[PDB]
A paper describes a structure:
Anchoring of these surface proteins to the cell wall peptidoglycan requires transpeptidase enzymes called sortases, a product of an srt (surface protein sorting) gene. The membrane-associated sortase recognizes the LPXTG motif of the substrate protein, cleaves between the Thr and Gly, and forms an acyl-enzyme intermediate. According to the current model of sortase-mediated pilus assembly, the pilus polymerization catalyzed by a pilus-specific sortase is followed by cell wall anchoring of pilus polymers by the housekeeping sortase. To understand the molecular basis of pilin sorting and pilus anchoring within a bacterial strain, we investigated the housekeeping sortase, GBSSrtA, and a pilus-specific sortase, GBSSrtC1, from the PI-1 pathogenicity island of S. agalactiae SAG 2603 V/R. Either GBSSrtC1 or GBSSrtC2 of this GBS strain is capable of polymerizing GBS80, the pilus shaft of the GBS PI-1 pili.
The two molecules of the dimer, related by a non-crystallographic 2-fold axis, in the asymmetric unit of both the type II and III crystals of the GBSSrtC1 display the typical sortase fold made of an eight-stranded beta-barrel. The barrel core is flanked by two long N-terminal helices (H1 and H2), positioned approximately at 75° to each other and away from the dimer interface, which is formed by β6 strands and β4/β5 loops. Subtle differences, such as one single-turn α-helix in the β1/β2 loop present only in chain B of both dimers, and a four-turn and two-turn H1 helix in the type III and II structures, respectively, may explain the plasticity in the sortase structural features, the presence of multimers in the asymmetric unit and the observed multiple crystal-packing arrangements. Residues 44–55 and 44–54 in type II (A and B chains, respectively) and 44–51 and 46–53 in type III (chain A and B, respectively), which cover the putative active site from one-end to the other, form the lid region in GBSSrtC1. Analogous to the Asp58, Pro59 and Trp60 residues of the conserved DP(W/F/Y) motif in SPNSrtC1, Asp49, Pro50 and Tyr51 of GBSSrtC1 anchored the lid in its active site. In addition, the preceding leucine residue (Leu47) was observed inserted into a highly hydrophobic pocket in the active site present below the lid. Cys184 in the GBSSrtC1 monomers displayed a single conformation with its sulfhydryl pointing toward Arg193, which adopted a similar conformation in all of the monomers due to salt-bridge interactions with Asp49 of the lid DP(W/F/Y) motif. Arg193 also formed a weak hydrogen bond with the backbone carbonyl of Asn190, except in the type II chain A structure. Based on its lowest overall B value within the hexamer, ordered catalytic residues and positive density for all residues, we selected molecule X2 of GBSSrtA for comparison with the type II chain A molecule of GBSSrtC1.
Numbering used by the authors: 6 to 39, 44 to 55, 60 to 207
Amino acid sequence: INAFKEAVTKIDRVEINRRLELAYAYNASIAGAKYPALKDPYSAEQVVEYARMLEVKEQIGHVIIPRINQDIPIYAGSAEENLQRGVGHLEGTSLPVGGESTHAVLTAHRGLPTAKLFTNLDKVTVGDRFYIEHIGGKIAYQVDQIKVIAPDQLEDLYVIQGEDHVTLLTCTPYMINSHRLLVRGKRIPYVEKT
């Protein structure tokens, strides 16, 4: 929410860059494999510390989607704790700080009575934009692909070398959840202007 934007301003640029660098290294690591053992976010299988460097007052950034007027905190891992309050990052996929050979997967709950979250993620079209905001600032994506897969298929979630992507992942059809609707953005130039 607001505790992020503010809490961020209070941190020193050097500290920030130290922390971003640690994330880039993580990402470069993931990019390098071979394929990470990826695991259905929608199950208990046991706090998470992989993304400590990005963590600022519990979150690691914010996901903005103008088309559906959503601005949702992001939390590391996909524990139900976090899916109750916002989007959860899927451990094994790139940290959502961007860079070539990264593919971050962000996942969210549809239909919750508390928050809407990715409830209206079906209204998102190719062409649309969303933004990840993190300790580093705000980066921009343009939806380049929307795809419906079976729950045990994952090829679509891996890093694509030389490419910079973020996928918003939810369940589908609405209220049947036999499948997974993936909305994947592709990094585009964005000059944050006051």
